[PDB]
Design a protein around this ligand. Structure first.
Ligand SMILES: CCCCCCCC/C=C/CCCCCCCC(=O)OC[C@H](COP(=O)(O)OCCN)OC(=O)CCCCCCC/C=C/CCCCCCCC
Ligand SMILES: CCCCCCCC/C=C\CCCCCCCC(=O)OC[C@H](COP(=O)(O)OCCN)OC(=O)CCCCCCC/C=C/CCCCCCCC
Ligand SMILES: CCCCCCCC/C=C\CCCCCCCC(=O)OC[C@H](COP(=O)(O)OCCN)OC(=O)CCCCCCC/C=C/CCCCCCCC
Ligand SMILES: CC(C)CCC[C@@H](C)[C@H]1CC[C@H]2[C@@H]3CC=C4C[C@@H](OC(=O)CCC(=O)O)CC[C@]4(C)[C@H]3CC[C@]12C
Ligand SMILES: C/C(=C\Cc1c(C)c(O)c2ccccc2c1O)CCC[C@H](C)CCC[C@H](C)CCCC(C)C
Ligand SMILES: *[C@@H]1O[C@H](CO)[C@@H](O[C@@H]2O[C@H](CO)[C@@H](O)[C@H](O)[C@H]2NC(C)=O)[C@H](O)[C@H]1NC(C)=O
Ligand SMILES: *[C@@H]1O[C@H](CO)[C@@H](O[C@@H]2O[C@H](CO)[C@@H](O)[C@H](O)[C@H]2NC(C)=O)[C@H](O)[C@H]1NC(C)=O
Ligand SMILES: CC(C)CCC[C@@H](C)[C@H]1CC[C@H]2[C@@H]3CC=C4C[C@@H](O)CC[C@]4(C)[C@H]3CC[C@]12C
Ligand SMILES: *[C@@H]1O[C@H](CO)[C@@H](O)[C@H](O)[C@H]1NC(C)=O
Lengths: 674, 42
């Protein structure tokens, strides 16, 4: 029975439905589950005011604002601001009750429902760790996590030290393993393997030990990319098995400690650190409190044999032959199996919902594809056509939006176009006809259009289960040009800049050259283009390898005339900044000479003086920065509390008057210690 | 007015992003009038 010690069960336990049900309901020590519940509740309590947006609620959900939102379902609408504050208060109470283990099930539901409502209210705030928090809350709703280290055991001692079914830990370990393994499998992509996704990360000072034995490129490739992929692929296997648990624990601890400093991901790293000890023995906290000195062993609750509970069945050779599996046991086993199957299927179900498939598959947030893709937006142009007269107009990019994520998805763009068609009549525009022109680059690559600029999106057809016709395909046959592009970029001076563009056949690009760029030129790399000067009405054709100078403060047009996509580049240098810098440098030397013998210099020298005060900060001990950090956190907490109190009093009693509200809001922004 | 640009300013082409990391909310259009209508002269 080497298998029996390797995986904790036998092959005969998975031969029949009854045997599987009996195995998956075996009693277990609930100490580790209780500690994880406590930590997750505490982290969620601390995370609600910061990342969920309680401290910016009065800015986000102002009652009379003109704004376009992006919900998953258009029938879902937000509530008035006071009711939003009430929703956040209920969520906070649920999180606190989950942390303390008081009224566990009701508190779990009270946290779960408003949290998921708020999550579904806005697609542009979806990411992987918020989705993970929702999944964890849903999982913990059905578990017996209040059998230890809780206040439901200090009020009724029958739920004290009572066992739990086996699948409680199995589902959580499966979730963690799924996250790790699917993240690793998603990192089996050509951009990650070749080292394009995170190429500036290795320059951080935290990587300095590794640069003693390796160059910068080797540190970027071997450590950040290949090492991360190997850790993702092996973390679950290392944590599961007993022989390699300590080594894997050290690796994951280092990984999450480094990630907590390299990025700004909220509380994800601490959640992962707290979830790692779920792979140890279910009685490890008992051993931990046993290993403490005996002087600290008389105040903690007495350590006794855990009492039986009805949530788990007991099978013994002597203590009764067995019991028939009740409805609860079969329900739990079915929940475990179906939930794990659904969690495996969902990140790979993009072949059914084709209306959310852009260059990248599906909506972002539930596929564990973290940090694999990076985007750069060069230009966004929105133009409308008046349906009553026919004038052409141009909108500011994102007038009524509160985010920028709409530039990458067709569903969000359709929602935004509908918003604009509804809202523009209030600004003297009749039956608008709206077109979009968006240029994006992904993991370097030439800039190109993502949507068709000749399609009126208001009447464009979109469906959740159909491939979108107006989405442009990604030009993945020009990827091997990236090394040459990097060579060209590095082969320049420190005053000249370059922009690379690839254009589909049949489309043109109208560009206005600013008056500050007197020395600008275009050079063709592939295909063939025809360049037009609008003022002189002159057409000139460029062949591969030849360049052209362009006038400043004028319009010009670039037509792609080849049957295949053509690539060119823009080279320019900002002339005004050149003169500004070369006169400021002369003035500084003149000042030095006058010593030895202008508002612009004033502003520049002030900015560098405060940057040298930042250098002093570098010399200043870290305790000052820690004090500033604590003060900022205290400010945001106090402001959120006071705003919630004001809104709740308005709900319960009524709005007093404008002046009293003004005084209360003025007090709420007091900046306690600055 | 504040929702419209010129053709010159819209055509200026020459003027990275990860979606896992998580604030000019007060620079919305018409924000101040609504804020004073809801909260008074703050
Ligand atoms: C053999 C079937 C899969 C079981 C795990 C195989 C281990 C090999 C590599 C996987 C690494 C970790 C997998 C994810 C963790 C979930 C499984 C788990 O926790 O099982 C442990 C636990 C024993 O734990 P302890 O007694 O503490 O022993 C620990 C050993 N020191 O074992 C069980 O609870 C038995 C679980 C039976 C299988 C149920 C879980 C797996 C479900 C499969 C997911 C897909 C859904 C349905 C699949 C349909 C087709 C089969
Ligand atoms: C006067 C107050 C009245 C009440 C007093 C009670 C509160 C005081 C005591 C508790 C201290 C924590 C509350 C205040 C902390 C404020 C700081 C804070 O949360 O900041 C978030 C900060 C991140 O900062 P950002 O702003 O993202 O970084 C800057 C870039 N934007 O997050 C943190 O530092 C998290 C700190 C909490 C960690 C505690 C949990 C760690 C758990 C990991 C343990 C690992 C193993 C556990 C094993 C058991 C597992 C079952
Ligand atoms: C329902 C809560 C689930 C929470 C999501 C967490 C991650 C789940 C992964 C899926 C993410 C997105 C796929 C969802 C498919 C269904 C989407 C849907 O019905 O609504 C889309 C669309 C709205 O389009 P917008 O772009 O807002 O409008 C554009 C014009 N302004 O809605 C409609 O077209 C009307 C209704 C469509 C058909 C209704 C559904 C009938 C078929 C049921 C299957 C669909 C859902 C299955 C759920 C999968 C389980 C997770
Ligand atoms: C004499 C007059 C000026 C009264 C002003 C007192 C304020 C400074 C008090 C009133 C409300 C207090 C807040 C009420 C609630 C909390 C929640 C509390 O939440 C926790 O995170 C504690 C539990 C945990 O650690 O998880 C942290 C302190 C804080 C922000 C308090 C900080 C201090 C505040 C703002
Ligand atoms: C950019 C990176 C990961 C993206 C990511 C993040 C941020 C997570 O939070 C994840 C959490 C769970 C699952 C997947 C996650 C994920 O995919 C790692 C790249 C940088 C990293 C710090 C390098 C690690 C060094 C390697 C592991 C070897 C060093 C070992 C020494 C002790 C010798
Ligand atoms: C416009 O800018 C380009 C690029 O900055 C200039 O071309 C450089 O000219 C110098 C000669 O002084 C050469 O040493 C560089 O190798 C050239 N670089 C490139 C990329 O060609 C060009 O001279 C500038 N034009 C004017 C009128 O100043
Ligand atoms: C310069 O050449 C381009 C094409 O390379 C011309 O653009 C075409 O103009 C006609 C007339 O309006 C349109 O029907 C076509 O759709 C345009 N594009 C193409 C690809 O043919 C442009 O008119 C020329 N300019 C001058 C002054 O002759
Ligand atoms: C009415 C308001 C307040 C609450 C609405 C709650 C509903 C919509 C919430 C509660 C629990 C949520 C579910 C929790 C877990 C999962 C599993 C995941 O893999 C897909 C989403 C899915 C299936 C969620 C969909 C939305 C859900 C069903
Ligand atoms: C060139 O620099 C000036 C200030 O030095 C700046 O105002 C201008 O916007 C720059 N040119 C471009 C095209 O951004």
């Amino acid at each position: 029975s080497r298998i029996g010690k390797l995986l904790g069960f036998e092959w005969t336990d998975l031969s029949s439905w009854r045997r599987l049900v009996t195995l998956l309901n075996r009693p277990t020590d609930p100490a580790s589950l209780a500690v994880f519940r406590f930590l997750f509740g505490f982290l969620m309590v601390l995370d609600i005011p910061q990342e969920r947006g309680l401290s910016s609620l009065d800015r986000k959900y102002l009652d009379g604002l003109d704004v376009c939102r992006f919900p998953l379902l258009d029938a879902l609408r937000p509530l008035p601001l006071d009711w939003m504050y009430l929703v956040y208060t209920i969520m906070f109470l649920g999180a606190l009750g989950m942390m303390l283990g008081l009224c566990y099930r009701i508190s779990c539901v009270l946290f779960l429902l408003p949290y998921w409502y708020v999550f579904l209210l806005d697609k542009t705030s979806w990411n992987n760790h918020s989705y993970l928090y929702g999944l964890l809350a849903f999982q913990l709703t059905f578990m017996d996590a209040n059998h230890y280290w809780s206040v439901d055991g200090l009020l009724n001692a029958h739920r004290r030290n009572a066992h739990v079914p086996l699948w409680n830990y199995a589902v959580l370990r499966g979730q963690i393993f799924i996250v790790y393994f699917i993240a690793g499998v998603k990192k089996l992509d050509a951009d990650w393997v070749e080292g394009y996704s995170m190429e500036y990360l290795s320059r951080h000072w935290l990587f300095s030990p590794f640069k003693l034995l390796l160059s910068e490129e080797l540190t970027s490739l071997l450590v950040v990319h290949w090492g991360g992929l190997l850790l993702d692929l092996s973390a679950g296997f290392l944590l599961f098995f007993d022989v390699s648990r300590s080594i894997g624990l050290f690796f994951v601890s280092y990984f999450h400690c480094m990630n907590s400093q390299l990025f700004s991901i909220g509380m994800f790293s601490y959640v992962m650190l707290a979830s790692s000890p779920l792979f140890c023995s279910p009685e490890w906290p008992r051993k931990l409190v046993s290993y403490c000195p005996r002087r600290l062993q008389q105040l903690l609750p007495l350590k006794a044999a855990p009492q039986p509970s009805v949530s788990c069945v007991y099978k013994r050779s002597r203590g009764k032959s067995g019991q028939k599996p009740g409805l609860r046991h079969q329900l739990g086993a079915a929940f475990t199996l179906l939930y794990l199957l659904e969690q495996l299927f969902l990140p790979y179900s993009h072949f059914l919902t084709q209306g959310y498939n852009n260059w990248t598959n599906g909506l972002y947030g539930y596929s564990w594809d973290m940090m694999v893709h990076s985007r750069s937006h060069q230009h966004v142009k929105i133009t409308y056509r008046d349906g009553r007269t026919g004038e052409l107009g141009y909108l500011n990019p994102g007038v009524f939006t509160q985010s920028r994520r709409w530039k990458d998805h067709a569903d969000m763009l359709k929602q935004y176009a509908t918003c604009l068609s509804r809202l523009l009549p209030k600004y003297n525009v009749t039956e608008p006809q709206i077109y979009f022109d968006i240029w994006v680059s992904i993991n370097d690559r030439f800039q190109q259009r993502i949507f068709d600029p000749r399609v009126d999106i208001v009447q464009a057809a979109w469906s959740p289960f159909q491939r979108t016709s107006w989405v442009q395909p990604l030009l993945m046959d020009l990827s091997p040009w990236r090394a040459k592009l990097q060579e060209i970029k590095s082969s320049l001076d420190n005053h000249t800049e370059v922009v690379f563009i690839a254009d589909f056949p049949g489309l043109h690009l109208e560009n206005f050259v600013s008056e500050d760029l007197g020395n600008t030129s275009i050079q063709l790399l592939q295909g063939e283009v025809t360049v037009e000067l609008v003022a002189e009405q002159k057409n000139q054709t460029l062949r591969e390898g030849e360049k052209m100078q362009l006038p400043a403060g004028e319009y010009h047009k670039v037509y792609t005339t080849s049957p295949s996509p053509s690539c060119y580049m823009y080279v320019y240098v900002n002339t005004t900044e050149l003169a500004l810098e070369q006169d400021l440098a002369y003035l500084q030397e003149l000042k030095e000479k006058v010593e030895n013998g202008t508002p612009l210099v004033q502003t520049f020298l002030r900015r560098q003086q405060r940057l040298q005060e930042i250098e002093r900060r570098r010399n200043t001990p870290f305790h000052e920065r820690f004090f500033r950090f604590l003060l900022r956190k205290l400010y945001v907490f106090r402001r959120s509390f006071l705003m919630t109190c004001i809104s709740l009093r308005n709900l319960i009693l009524g709005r007093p008057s404008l002046e009293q509200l003004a005084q209360e809001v003025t007090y709420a922004n007091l900046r306690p210690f600055e | 007015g504040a929702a419209f640009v010129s053709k010159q300013e819209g055509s200026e082409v020459v003027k990275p992003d990860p979606l896992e990391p998580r604030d000019e909310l007060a620079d919305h259009i018409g924000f101040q009038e609504a804020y004073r209508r809801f909260y008074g002269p703050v």
